[PDB]
Design a protein around this nucleic acid. Structure first.
Ligand SMILES: [Zn+2]
Lengths: 71, 112, 73, 173, 77
RNA sequence: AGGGAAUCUGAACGAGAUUCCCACUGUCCCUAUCUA
RNA sequence: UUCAAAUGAGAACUUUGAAGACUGAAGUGGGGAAAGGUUCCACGUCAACAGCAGUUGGACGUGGGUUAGUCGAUCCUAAGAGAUGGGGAAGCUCCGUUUCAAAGGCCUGAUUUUAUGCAGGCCACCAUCGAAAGGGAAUCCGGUUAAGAUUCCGGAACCUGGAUAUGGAUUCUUCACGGUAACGUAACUGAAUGUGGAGACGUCGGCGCGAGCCCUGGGAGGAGUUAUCUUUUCUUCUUAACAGCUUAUCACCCCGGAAUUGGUUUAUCCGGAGAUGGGGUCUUAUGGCUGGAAGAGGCCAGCACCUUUGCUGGCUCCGGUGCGCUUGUGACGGCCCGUGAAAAUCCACAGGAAGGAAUAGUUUUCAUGCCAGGUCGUACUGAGGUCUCCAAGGUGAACAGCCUCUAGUUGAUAGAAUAAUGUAGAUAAGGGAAGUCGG
RNA sequence: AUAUUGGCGAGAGACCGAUAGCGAACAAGUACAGUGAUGGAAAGAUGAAAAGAACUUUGAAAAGAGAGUGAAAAAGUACGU
């Protein structure tokens, strides 16, 4: 996940099972003040949902990761 | 001498699952799924491939202009020009047989 | 394998072809039970599960099916 | 997504035909037009007339979807229904032969008021005075009318009364 | 990808203001059978598809790079 | 550029059957040796 | 199987290098449907299991791992199933699938003439489920991980739906014209209703054409063998989706009128219901050039290095060939009274309702421009014991074998002996069924 | 008044005492077996208190020998007798 932050400019979140791609794009844009290029989702083998949130070129995922708390 | 796999999930040799072995710019052979071939539109009266109409997938006719889907005559995009000719002749002479039958009918009534 | 997971009892006894559960009788409204199958009755009776609502009925009756709120003595 | 149906989206849910408006309201054409007169609702012109239809080039008038969709919940429509109930329940009394109960049905009759219908139409007073242009032209015509079987004398006397009130004020201030 | 064998058409595309970058590609090719020459390739990312311009001449290339808007980012090769 | 000839059976037959004539062989006289 | 080295307390069994073999494209190869459910990968580990062992694992413990507007499901219907209306049945529930059901969804209007209570018309079958191999809008190439790829990245695309904006057209103002014709076009309105095409369809045979594979000549690089002969053996020399022009058998149109019977196939059918001939039209199959695109991939070479340290130059070209194999397509000819699923979806014609001008007439199937595309599956395995796809070469008359290239294995307890017996296979003096019920 | 092997809640026994008493004193309607309906186990006790063996030595480690805790390891999770 930390590799995917730096290279592809992609934030990796654990999203709840009920929420779709519109709701992830809306959630990130609301909470983190950052526009989203695309969201890709997959159901994890354990039963939860992973989400690959790629941000637009005007925003950096490394900076926002240092902004929230995880690095 | 590269051997080649199916690309989509169907492992079977159906009508939809045809294969063209194509050489890629990576210097290797790989399969290409062949789109199911378009047919000629046909004469509704004749049963023959009518000239001047584009041959496309059914859905693919929506994108193209009306000048690729119709020839300029009456019954243009649906008939032959031979089958149009034949029904111009037929509708004329049937319409004139009606006149002759009225002439005979009016004459027989005058006789009675 | 003729059978797949049931929705009502989740026992994997929903016969695929017949489209019915051989254990609980889904989707016929009445849950399948027989007097000759007394052991089978014990496996699926009230009490085997959670009793989310039916636990507390005795408590509520003992109190006299009372509404409102306590008033701080 | 699945391939969306063509003629159900953009101009097809933005506008509706007269027939579709009448049917949706479950109201008579007359009463649809009566509410349309009161509410200040008019047909609107789309940029595509055939995309506003379901493909057809046809003689059609288009209303605004959200306008009719907003008319549906309204006290005046409910009061029109109440007038219809009153109409049959009166002719029940009259048609039988009892006159006293019919006369009593007149006493126990409320009517629709056009009070709240103006607040939503002309919210500011200067906006109402921008409409009074066309409003005073009807009313001053209807003062200068002989009463017929179409139009009762009470109607013309009340209209003339308002006319005289208007003339009195303009000559006052 | 689409061929435009048309000079001012390319220059109309460059001043669209929805265009960020351009590219000038240089090639080494030979005519008929005799002599080697230098080919240029003027490519813009258009509104939908990429438009390309083969100019076999070197002087017309020399004029065209000069004739581009100076604010536009130009890429060699 | 394995035989051959008869016969019993349904004139050749059919891996039909039997008998004989010719050839062949460890089946035997009589076993001996080698390899797996 | 062996030799060497590394790891470890410990090595026939772990790993690496070397030798020997085995599978020999009808693989012990690489993919999938089903099925399994984390077996995939890493680190830690040997308590139990993998019938010897083990430092190894399809084991154990802890973590990591499956990303889609274009691939599937999702949609449609098939054979069938199954509610509703009805009718049985003490009943659990069964019959029945359009039936003697009031099964509903659209248009017209100055507001409907005893005054503001809705009139007239159009259409006549029937919910739904049922396919991850049937029908179906649209995505490729290169790159990327310990493990994910048509899903991620870079590049380049396409489809569908929706608002709308501009240019062009609609001609002296009101729905364009050329061609004898087949038909051609940047457009060139078309309601109810009626119809047609695609979807959309049995099987084989030879023949034509195309793509991939195979064989090969020249040339531009590298690896090998060489005492001898050999311009030798091996390897690299690549071109995706999509896009712009262009390329055609068949079929049709005009001229022409034929026996002295002609044309013509591999296969004897074709012609006064118009042959040969002369001239044209059409579909874009499939090829060619161009763009994508050489900027990528490949083969080399030279120059820097504790180093997360790569850079700099080249070449990446020109051809040929077939009773070949694979596959795609075209025109024919047989085989039948066997006449060759359905539906969703898309297009077209007939029709002639309505609409269309003087401070933006009507119409956008013409060109350009804008936005958006949800959910679930996606890991891996898939080997007397379920289904399925791809398929190199040589010698030889050969589908006989024998040998190999690509790729993948070396797994199955080991070691020490080697007499008789037993099973199986050979050979044998002389004689030639004398054996045995019976070569 | 009467019935009441279910439910809610009590009180009792000349009853059984872990192969008994319910199938189940316990991760029991559990593990597991079966396509499925169903079938369906085994398994209680250290000590008063973990005080569950600090530390040293032998071994790659499990463990062993010392040492210690305890009234007792002739109670060391393989634990009452
Ligand atoms: Zn059940």
């Amino acid at each position: 996940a930390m590799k995917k932050v730096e290279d592809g400019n992609i934030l990796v979140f654990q999203v709840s099972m009920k929420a779709n791609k519109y709701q992830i794009k809306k959630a990130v844009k609301e909470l983190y003040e950052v526009d989203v290029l695309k969201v890709n989702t997959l159901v994890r083998p354990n039963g939860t949902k992973k989400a690959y949130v790629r941000l637009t070129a005007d925003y950096d995922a490394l900076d926002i990761a240092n902004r929230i708390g995880y690095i | 001498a590269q051997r080649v796999t199916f690309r989509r999930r169907n492992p079977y040799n159906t009508r939809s699952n045809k294969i063209k072995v194509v050489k890629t710019p990576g210097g290797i052979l790989r399969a290409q799924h062949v789109k199911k071939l378009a047919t000629r539109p046909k004469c509704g009266d004749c049963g023959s491939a009518l000239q001047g109409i584009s041959t496309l997938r059914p859905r693919q006719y929506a994108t193209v202009s009306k000048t690729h889907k119709t020839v300029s005559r009456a019954y243009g995009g649906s008939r032959c020009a031979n089958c149009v000719k034949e029904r111009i002749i037929r509708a004329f002479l049937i319409e004139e047989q009606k006149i002759v039958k009225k002439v005979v009918k009016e004459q027989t009534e005058a006789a009675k | 394998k003729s059978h797949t997971l049931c929705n009502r009892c989740g026992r994997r006894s929903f016969h695929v072809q017949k489209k019915t559960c051989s254990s609980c009788g889904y989707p016929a409204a009445k849950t399948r039970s027989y007097n000759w199958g007394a052991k089978a009755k014990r496996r699926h009776t009230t009490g085997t599960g959670r009793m989310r609502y039916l636990k507390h009925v005795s408590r509520r009756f003992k109190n006299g099916f009372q509404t409102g709120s306590a008033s701080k003595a | 997504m699945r391939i969306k149906k063509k003629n159900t989206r953009g101009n097809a849910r933005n506008f509706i035909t007269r027939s579709q408006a009448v049917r949706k309201l479950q109201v008579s054409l007359a009463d649809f037009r009566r509410l349309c007169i009161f509410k200040g609702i008019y047909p609107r012109e789309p940029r595509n007339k055939k995309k506003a239809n379901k493909g057809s080039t046809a003689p059609t008038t288009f209303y605004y979807a959200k306008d009719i969709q907003y008319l549906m919940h309204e006290p005046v429509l409910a009061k029109f229904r109440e007038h219809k109930t009153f109409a049959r329940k009166l002719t029940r009394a009259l048609g039988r032969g009892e006159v006293s109960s019919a006369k009593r049905l007149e006493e126990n009759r409320d009517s629709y008021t056009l009070d709240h219908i103006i607040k939503e139409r002309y919210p500011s007073f200067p906006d109402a005075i921008r409409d009074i242009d066309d409003a005073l032209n009807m009313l001053f015509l209807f003062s200068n009318l002989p009463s017929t079987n179409q139009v009762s004398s009470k109607i013309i006397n009340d209209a003339q009364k308002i006319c005289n009130q208007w003339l009195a004020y303009v000559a006052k201030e | 990808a689409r061929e435009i064998t048309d000079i001012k058409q390319f220059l109309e595309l460059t001043r669209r203001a929805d265009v960020k970058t351009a590219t000038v590609k240089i090639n080494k090719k030979l005519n008929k059978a005799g002599k080697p020459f230098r080919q240029t390739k003027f490519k813009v990312r258009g509104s939908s598809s990429l438009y390309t311009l083969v100019i076999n001449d070197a002087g017309k290339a020399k004029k065209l790079i000069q004739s581009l808007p100076p604010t536009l980012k130009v890429n060699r090769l």
